[PDB]
Amino acid sequence: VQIVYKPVDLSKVTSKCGSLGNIHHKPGGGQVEVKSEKLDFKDRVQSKIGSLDNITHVPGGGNKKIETHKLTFR
Amino acid sequence: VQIVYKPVDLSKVTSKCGSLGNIHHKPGGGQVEVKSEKLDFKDRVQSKIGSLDNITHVPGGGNKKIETHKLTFR
Amino acid sequence: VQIVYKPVDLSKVTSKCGSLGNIHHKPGGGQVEVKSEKLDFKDRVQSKIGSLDNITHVPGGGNKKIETHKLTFR
Amino acid sequence: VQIVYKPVDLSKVTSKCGSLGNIHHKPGGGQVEVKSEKLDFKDRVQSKIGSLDNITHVPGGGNKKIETHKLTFR
Amino acid sequence: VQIVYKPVDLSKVTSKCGSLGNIHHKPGGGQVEVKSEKLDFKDRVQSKIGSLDNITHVPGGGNKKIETHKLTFR
Amino acid sequence: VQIVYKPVDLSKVTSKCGSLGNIHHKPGGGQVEVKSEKLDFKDRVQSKIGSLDNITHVPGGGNKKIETHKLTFR
Amino acid sequence: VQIVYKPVDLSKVTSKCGSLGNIHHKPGGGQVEVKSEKLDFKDRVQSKIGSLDNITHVPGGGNKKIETHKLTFR
Amino acid sequence: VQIVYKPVDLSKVTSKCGSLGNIHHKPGGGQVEVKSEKLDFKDRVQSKIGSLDNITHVPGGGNKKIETHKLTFR
Amino acid sequence: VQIVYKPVDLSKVTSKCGSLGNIHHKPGGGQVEVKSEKLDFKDRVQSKIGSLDNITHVPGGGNKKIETHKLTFR
Amino acid sequence: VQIVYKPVDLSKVTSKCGSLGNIHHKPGGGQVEVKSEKLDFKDRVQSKIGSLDNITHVPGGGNKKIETHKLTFR
């Protein structure tokens, strides 16, 4: 029983951008009304209730590598 | 019983952009009204209830590699 | 019993863009009204209830490679 | 029973950006009204209730590598 | 029973940015009203209730590597 | 030359209303964009240019009598 | 030359209202953008340029009598 | 030449209101942007330029009589 | 030449209100941006430029009589 | 030449109000930005430039009589 785990990974992620100019985020907010009474969350819940919200994201490169290696022997 | 796991991966993701000009995000917000009473979430729930929301995303390159390697021996 | 897993992968994703000009996202928001009483979510639910929402996405290259390698021995 | 875990990983994430110009985030806030009575959270809950909020994120490069290696022997 | 855990990891994350110019975050705050009575949180809860909040983040490079190596022998 | 101006005016305006119930004025505002360069107004001009506006008027009786008496001798 | 100006005016304006209940004026504001360069107003001009505005008027009776008496002898 | 100016005016304005209940004026403000360069106003100008504004008026009776008597002898 | 100016004026303005209840004026302010360079006002100008403003007026009776009597002999 | 100016004026303004209850004026202020360079005002100008301002007026009776009597002999 011989298991050889040898992932040869050569990877490059490259973003080339000269200049990012005028980014204008001007939003006139509104109205959010939320009515509830009983909220039950047990395990690993991500919940946003009644949000007015503004996200301006300007990453120079925004590159993301996700690598998962799982080996299980039963 | 011999298992040879040898993924030779050579990968390149390349975005070339000179300049990003005028990005204008001006939204006049409105009205969101949500009525509930009983909310039950058990396991691994992602829930957005009653949101007014504004996302401006300007990544220079926006490149994303997702690589999953799973080996299971039963 | 010999299993040789050798995926030779040479892949390139290339986006070349000189300049991105005027992107104008101006939306006049409206009205969203949602009435419920009892919401039950058990496992791995993604749910958006009562959203008014504005997404401006301007990636320089927007390239995404998804690679899944699964080997199972029973 | 021999398990050889040898992931040779050579990876580079590169963002090149000359200059980031005018980023203007001016949002006129609105009104968020949330009414509840009983909230029960047991295990590992992330919950935002009644937020008006403004996030301006301008990372020079915004590169993120996530690598998970899991080996389990039963 | 021989387990060889030898992950050879060579990784570099590089952000090159000349200059970051005018970042202007001027948000006119609004009104958040939240009414509840009974809140029960047992284990590992992260909860934000009734926040008006302003985050300006300008990291020179914003690079984050997350590496988890887990080996369990039962 | 005899001019007898004797307007005998007996007038009554009567509004009887028991109760005015739920008046709900919730309008999600939109977007108004107006471009001009040269505006010339000489005498007695009433002008509204580029307005987004909300008027809720609930008078208990809203009764209006307009009486003009003009006598001119040339 | 005899001018007898004798307007006998008996006038009553009557509003009877028991109770005025729930008046709710909640408007989510929007966006008004007005561009001009040269504005010339000489005599008796009433001008509103670029307004976002909210008027809630709840008079108990709202009764208005306008009476103009003009006599001119040339 | 005899001018008899004798306006017998008997006038009553009456508003009867028992109680005025819940008046709720909650407006989420928006954004007003006005660009001009040269503004010339000579005589008796009333001008509002670039206003975001909220007026809540709840007079118990709101009764207004306007009476103008003009006599001119040339 | 005999001018008899005898305006017999008997006028009563009456507002009867038992009680004025909950008046709630909660407005989430927004953003007003006004750009000009040269402003010239000569005679009797009333001008509001770049105002964000909140007026709550609750007069018990709000009754206003305006009476103008003008006699001119040329 | 006989001018008899005898305005017999009997006028009463009456506001009766039992009690004025909860008046709540809570406004979340915003942002006002005004740019100008040269302002010229000659005669009798009333001008408000760049104001954020909050007026709560609760007069018990708010009654105002304006009476102007002008007689001119040329």
UniProtKB/Swiss-Prot annotation, chains A, B, C, D, E, F, G, H, I, J:
Tissue/organ expression: Expressed in neurons. Isoform PNS-tau is expressed in the peripheral nervous system while the others are expressed in the central nervous system.
Mutagenesis / variant outcome for changing S47L: In fatal respiratory hypoventilation; unusual apparent autosomal recessive inheritance; reduced binding to microtubules as well as increased fibrillization and aggregation
Modified residues (N6,N6-dimethyllysine): K6
Disease / disorder: In Alzheimer disease, the neuronal cytoskeleton in the brain is progressively disrupted and replaced by tangles of paired helical filaments (PHF) and straight filaments, mainly composed of hyperphosphorylated forms of TAU (PHF-TAU or AD P-TAU). O-GlcNAcylation is greatly reduced in Alzheimer disease brain cerebral cortex leading to an increase in TAU/MAPT phosphorylations. Frontotemporal dementia 1: A form of dementia characterized by pathologic finding of frontotemporal lobar degeneration, presenile dementia with behavioral changes, deterioration of cognitive capacities and loss of memory. In some cases, parkinsonian symptoms are prominent. Neuropathological changes include frontotemporal atrophy often associated with atrophy of the basal ganglia, substantia nigra, amygdala. In most cases, protein tau deposits are found in glial cells and/or neurons.
Main function: Promotes microtubule assembly and stability, and might be involved in the establishment and maintenance of neuronal polarity. The C-terminus binds axonal microtubules while the N-terminus binds neural plasma membrane components, suggesting that tau functions as a linker protein between both. Axonal polarity is predetermined by TAU/MAPT localization (in the neuronal cell) in the domain of the cell body defined by the centrosome. The short isoforms allow plasticity of the cytoskeleton whereas the longer isoforms may preferentially play a role in its stabilization.
Residues the record lists as Omega-N-methylarginine modifications: R44
Post-translational modification: Phosphorylation at serine and threonine residues in S-P or T-P motifs by proline-directed protein kinases (PDPK1, CDK1, CDK5, GSK3, MAPK) (only 2-3 sites per protein in interphase, seven-fold increase in mitosis, and in the form associated with paired helical filaments (PHF-tau)), and at serine residues in K-X-G-S motifs by MAP/microtubule affinity-regulating kinase (MARK1, MARK2, MARK3 or MARK4), causing detachment from microtubules, and their disassembly. Phosphorylation decreases with age.
Record annotation: effect of changing S15F: In PIDB; markedly reduced ability of tau to promote microtubule assembly
Covalent link Glycyl lysine isopeptide (Lys-Gly) (interchain with G-Cter in ubiquitin), residues: K6, K12, K16, K26, K38, K42, K48, K64, K70
Highest taxon of the lineage: Eukaryota
Protein name, as recorded: Microtubule-associated protein tau
UniProt Tau/MAP repeat ranges: 1-31, 32-63
Residues of the whole record sequence present: 623 to 696 of 758
Glycosylated residues, chain numbering: K42, K48, K64
Residues of the site described as Not glycated: K6, K12, K16, K26, K35, K38, K65, K70
Localisation per UniProt entry: Cytoplasm, Cytosol; Cell membrane; Cytoplasm, Cytoskeleton; Cell projection, Axon
Organism, scientific name: Homo sapiens (Human)
Annotated domain remarks: The tau/MAP repeat binds to tubulin. Type I isoforms contain 3 repeats while type II isoforms contain 4 repeats.
N6-acetyllysine modification, residue list: K6, K12, K16, K26, K38, K42, K64
Gene designation: MAPT
Subunit structure, interactors included: Interacts with MARK1, MARK2, MARK3 and MARK4. Interacts with PSMC2 through SQSTM1. Interacts with SQSTM1 when polyubiquitinated. Interacts with FKBP4. Binds to CSNK1D. Interacts with SGK1. Interacts with PIN1. Interacts with LRRK2. Interacts with LRP1, leading to endocytosis; this interaction is reduced in the presence of LRPAP1/RAP.
Positions bearing Phosphoserine: S19, S47, S51
